[PDB]
Symmetry: D3
Subunit: 29 residues, 6 copies
């Protein structure tokens, strides 16, 4: 397993935070 799945969601969480980030950038420009 379950630790692998947990870290999979943690990595997906970083990826979605970065997606929100880059969407803030594209929202401005």
């Amino acid at each position: 397993x379950l630790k692998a799945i947990a870290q999979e969601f943690k990595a997906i969480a970083k990826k979605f935070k970065a997606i929100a980030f880059e969407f803030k950038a594209i929202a401005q420009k």
Copy 2:
């Protein structure tokens, strides 16, 4: 928009932090 888009993906990402957190807890228990 796109600012609402960014903030809602931010919320979704924080929900994956919660998800990961939950799987760590159930991983041993």
Copy 3:
């Protein structure tokens, strides 16, 4: 827990329709 997991993904699916709605408007305007 097991209830909590289904608890967040209910709201998560709740949000994806908001994403749909938003890009629905962006596609038009």
Copy 4:
């Protein structure tokens, strides 16, 4: 597009609610 994109996130929202409902099943029995 963007119409397909918004349509696809609507489908994703439909998938996730079933996913949650599915963990609801395992939460009981």
Copy 5:
């Protein structure tokens, strides 16, 4: 379940890959 979960996540992964595809197409367009 758990088979439904596995196939469901595989399907949503395929859908996200498809969306990545249209965003790659629209990046140049």
Copy 6:
């Protein structure tokens, strides 16, 4: 961006496919 968003979703698809594959292992065992 748009390319970064597409590659983010491509990574999302890869991790979700891995998760889907993984849950099948728990399903058998």
